Structure 1
Amino acid sequence: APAWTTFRVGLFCGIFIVLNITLVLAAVFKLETDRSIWPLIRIYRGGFLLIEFLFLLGINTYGWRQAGVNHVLIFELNPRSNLSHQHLFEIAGFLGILWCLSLLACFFAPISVIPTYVYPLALYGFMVFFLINPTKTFYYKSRFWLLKLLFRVFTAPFHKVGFADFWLADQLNSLSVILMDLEYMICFYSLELKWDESKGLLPGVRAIVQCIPAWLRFIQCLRRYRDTKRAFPHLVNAGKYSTTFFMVTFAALYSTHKERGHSDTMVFFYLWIVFYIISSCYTLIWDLKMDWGLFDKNAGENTFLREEIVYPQKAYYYCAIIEDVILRFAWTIQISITSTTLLPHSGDIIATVFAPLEVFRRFVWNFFRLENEHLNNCGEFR
C-alpha cells in the first residue's frame, strides 16, 4: 500500500486517540454534572459501533490478507481496486474523527449556534452523503457496491441471494443496535425531546424493528430453498432465526402483560426462559458445528476442531470458542433487553456494555466463517 495511505491511517488514528482522551476527560470532570446523558448515548453508540465495526473489519481484512484465503473471489468483488485493511482503517478513522467532533460539539454546545440537535444529525448526514455520492471522489466503487448490496438485502427475498448479500444481512444481526437506535432517534426527536428553547435534554414497533435483521435472514433462506429445492441446511437456518422471532415475541408479550393485569405473566416468563435457552443453543451449535466447521469427526488431531487449520496456532481457536459461548448468551440477552422493558433496572448500561461484545463476536465470526468458506463451501455459493 502507498505510503500516503499509511500516513493518513496514522494521522486519523492519532486524532482518534487524542479525541478519545479529551472525550473521557470532558465527560468525567466537566460536561454537565446533572444531565442524564443517557439519550445522547443511545443516539451515538450505534454509529460508534459502525466505526468500531469498520475498524474491526479492517483487522479482518488484514487476516484475510495475511491468511490470504479467498477474499477476492468469495465476495465476487472486482479482481482489481480491492480495499485493503489500511483503506478500511482510513475510512474508519475519518468517521471516528467526525464522531468525536460531534461528541465534543455536544459537550461544548457554545461552539456554535443551533445547539445539540444538528450535531448527531450532522454526523449521520455526513455519513449518508459519503455513502450515496455519484461524484466519484474516493473509493466510489466501494460505496456504490455497498449501496447496491443494501438494496439487494434490506428490501426483500425477491433478489437472488449471494455470499456478499448473505454476509451483510448476517452481520446486520449483530450491528442491529444501529437499527434500533435509529428508530429511537426518530421517536426521541418526535416526542421525548423538549426542542423548545435550547439544550433541551431533561437533566410496540421496536419489537418489529428488532426482528428486521432476523426477518431479512429468514426470507433470504426461504428464497434460497425456493430456488434450491434441497433444504439440508436452509430450513435449519430458518428455524434458527425463528428462535429469535419467538424470543423477541414473548419478551414483548411479557413486557406488555407484566403491568396490565394478566397474572399469568409467569407463564410468559417461563416461555421467555425456554426460548432464550433454545435460541442460544441453536445459534451456538449452528456456529460451532456447521458455520465455523469445527467439531469435525473426521479430524484426527487438534480435537474439537476440523482437519485443516489455516491460522498459525490452535490457541486462537479455544479461547475464541469460550468467548463465543459467552457472547452468544450476551447477544441473546442483549436483543431481548434492547427490544422492550424486560429489565426496568439498568438495562441501558447492560445494552451499552454488551453491544461492542456483539460486534467483537462478529469480528471473530467473520474470521472463522470466511476461513471455513474455502474448503467446505457452506451454502454452496461456490
Structure 2
Amino acid sequence: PAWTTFRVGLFCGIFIVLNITLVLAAVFKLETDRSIWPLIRIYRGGFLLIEFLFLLGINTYGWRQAGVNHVLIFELNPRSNLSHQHLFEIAGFLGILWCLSLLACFFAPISVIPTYVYPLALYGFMVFFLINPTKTFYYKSRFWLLKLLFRVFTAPFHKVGFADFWLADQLNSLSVILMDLEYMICFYSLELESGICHKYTYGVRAIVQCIPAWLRFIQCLRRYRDTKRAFPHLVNAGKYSTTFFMVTFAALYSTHKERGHSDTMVFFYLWIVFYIISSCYTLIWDLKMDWGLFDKNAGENTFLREEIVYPQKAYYYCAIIEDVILRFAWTIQISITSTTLLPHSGDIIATVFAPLEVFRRFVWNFFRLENEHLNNCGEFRA
C-alpha cells in the first residue's frame, strides 16, 4: 500500500541519517581521542549487524515489489513468510538496545554497574534472543536461521544450497563483526601492553579474518565434488583462496616490519600483487558470475544482461560503479583489519569502510537474487 511505502521510506531515511551521524561521530572520536578505540571496536560489530538486518529488510521489500521470487530461491515456506516490516522491527529493536547500551556505558549512570559490562550484556542478550526456546519472538524464522547457520559452519558435512552459500557470502561481508568480536575478547583477556591486541598482529587474527572465506572455499569444494564441474566451483575456490594468500602476506609483511630481516620489501610486493589479484577476482565474479551483467546476448541493454526485472538500468550502472569502488575498499579494509598495517589511520579506514561494505553486499544481494530468479546462475535449483 501507499502508506506502507511511506512508512518504509521514512524508516529508511531515519536509519540512513542516524547511521551516517554515528559513523561521523566515530571517525571524529578517532585521531582526536584516546582509549575510544576499544569502545568503537566493541560497538562496531553490533552497529554493522543492525545495519545488515535493516538493509536485508530493504532487500526483502524490494524483491517483493519488483516481483523477484526470493521465497522460491531460498526455498522458504510460501504459507509462512517474514515480511520486510518484521525485519525492520527486528533491526530497530536491536538498534534501540545498542543505543541504550552505548548511552549507559558513556554516561556511567550507576557506579554499581561497571561501564565495560554494558556492551557484553547487550551482546549476551542478543545471543539469548537468537537462541530462545520460548516462543516470545518469531520462532520459525529464528529456528530456520539457526539451522542454516549450523549447516553453513559445517560446510563439507552438508550439501550446499542457495541459502547456505548466500549466508556464507553475508558472513564474508560481515567478517568485520567476527574480527571485532575477537578483538573484544583479546581486550577483555589482556587489557582488562595497553594496545597489545592491536599493536602486533598474530596468527589467530588472520585465521579469524579468513574464516568466512574458509567456509566459502569448503562449500565450493563440496559443490565441485558433488557436480564434478571444475569451472563453476574451483574458480570460486581460488577466488576465495586469494583472500588467504593476501592475509598471510600482509601478516608476514607486518611481522617483518616489526622485526627487520631484509624480507619486508618482498613481502610488501607479494601483498600488493595478491591484493590486486583478489580485488580483480572478486570484482569479476560479482559483476559477471553473480549479477550476470556484461552478457553478450543483451542487445537492448548495454553492459547488462538481456533480461532485467528492475525498471531502470541506471540502477545497474551505479551498482557496477559502487561495487567496483567498494570491492577495492573492502579488500583494503580486510588487509588492515587482519594485520596491523597502518597504525593510526587503520581504525578510521575500517570504521568508514565496514558500513560501506555492508551496503555493497546489500546491493549485491539485490542483484544476485534478481539474477537467480531470472536464471539459475547458482544451479542450486533444478
- Cα gap change, 1:157/1:25 in structure 2, threshold over 3 Å: closer, same or farther? closer
Instruction: Please give the secondary structure, in 1, of the residue aligned with 2:373.
Output: coil
Distance 1:153 1:321 in 2: 28
- Cα gap change, 1:4/1:132 in structure 2, threshold over 3 Å: closer, same or farther? farther
Distance 2:310 2:93 in 1: 31
- Cα gap change, 1:99/1:15 in structure 2, threshold over 3 Å: closer, same or farther? farther
- 1:46 deviates by 1.2
- Cα gap change, 1:21/1:224 in structure 2, threshold over 3 Å: closer, same or farther? closer
The answer as to whether partners of 1:23 and 1:103 remain within 8 angstroms in 2 is: no
- 1:277 deviates by 0.7
Instruction: For 1:161-240, list aligned pairs within 5 A.
Output: 161-193=160-192, 204-240=203-239
Instruction: Please give the secondary structure, in 1, of the residue aligned with 2:92.
Output: helix
The answer as to whether partners of 2:174 and 2:358 remain within 8 angstroms in 1 is: yes
Instruction: Please give the secondary structure, in 2, of the residue aligned with 1:373.
Output: helix
Q: Deviations over 1:15-59 (max 9, x none)?
A: 979998998999999999965311100001011100000011111
The match for 1:380 is: 379
Q: CA RMSD in A?
A: 3.1
Instruction: For 1:1-382, list aligned pairs within 5 A.
Output: 36-111=35-110, 113-193=112-192, 204-382=203-381
Instruction: Please give the secondary structure, in 2, of the residue aligned with 1:34.
Output: coil
- Cα gap change, 1:21/1:380 in structure 2, threshold over 3 Å: closer, same or farther? closer
Q: Deviations over 1:222-254 (max 9, x none)?
A: 111111112221001001001111101100110
Distance 1:280 1:357 in 2: 16
Segments of 5+ residues of structure 2 without an aligned counterpart are 194-202
- 1:5 deviates by 10
- Cα gap change, 1:23/1:347 in structure 2, threshold over 3 Å: closer, same or farther? closer
The answer as to whether partners of 1:13 and 1:93 remain within 8 angstroms in 2 is: no
Distance 2:52 2:285 in 1: 23
- 1:368 deviates by 0.5
TM-score, length of structure 2 as denominator length: 0.90
- 1:264 deviates by 2.0
Q: Deviations over 1:287-309 (max 9, x none)?
A: 11111000001111221011011
Distance 1:58 1:86 in 2: 7
Q: Deviations over 1:281-333 (max 9, x none)?
A: 11111111111000001111221011011001111111111111101100110
Instruction: Please give the secondary structure, in 2, of the residue aligned with 1:133.
Output: coil
Distance 2:30 2:320 in 1: 40
Q: Deviations over 1:171-194 (max 9, x none)?
A: 111111110011111100000129
Higher mean alpha-carbon deviation, 6-15 vs 40-49, is at 6-15
- Cα gap change, 1:20/1:309 in structure 2, threshold over 3 Å: closer, same or farther? closer
- 1:72 deviates by 1.1
The answer as to whether partners of 2:43 and 2:119 remain within 8 angstroms in 1 is: yes
Distance 2:4 2:141 in 1: 16
- 1:156 deviates by 3.6
- 1:96 deviates by 0.3
Distance 1:28 1:348 in 2: 9
- Cα gap change, 1:152/1:47 in structure 2, threshold over 3 Å: closer, same or farther? same
Distance 1:159 1:50 in 2: 26
Distance 2:17 2:281 in 1: 43
- Cα gap change, 1:19/1:113 in structure 2, threshold over 3 Å: closer, same or farther? farther
Segments of 5+ residues of structure 1 without an aligned counterpart are 195-203
TM-score, length of structure 1 as denominator length: 0.90
The answer as to whether partners of 1:19 and 1:97 remain within 8 angstroms in 2 is: no
- Cα gap change, 1:9/1:136 in structure 2, threshold over 3 Å: closer, same or farther? farther
Q: Indicate the structure whose relative CO is greater, using CA pairs within 8 Å and at least 6 residues apart.
A: 2
Distance 1:140 1:162 in 2: 22
Q: Deviations over 1:48-81 (max 9, x none)?
A: 1000000111110011110121111110111122
Of Structure 1 and Structure 2, the greater helix share is in 2
- 1:159 deviates by 1.1
Q: Deviations over 1:134-182 (max 9, x none)?
A: 1112211111111111110123411111111110001111111110011
- Cα gap change, 1:140/1:343 in structure 2, threshold over 3 Å: closer, same or farther? same
The answer as to whether partners of 2:156 and 2:222 remain within 8 angstroms in 1 is: yes
How many residue pairs get aligned? The number is 372
- Cα gap change, 1:28/1:270 in structure 2, threshold over 3 Å: closer, same or farther? closer
The answer as to whether partners of 2:30 and 2:37 remain within 8 angstroms in 1 is: no
Instruction: Please give the secondary structure, in 2, of the residue aligned with 1:295.
Output: coil
Matched-pair identity in %: 100
The answer as to whether partners of 1:8 and 1:90 remain within 8 angstroms in 2 is: no
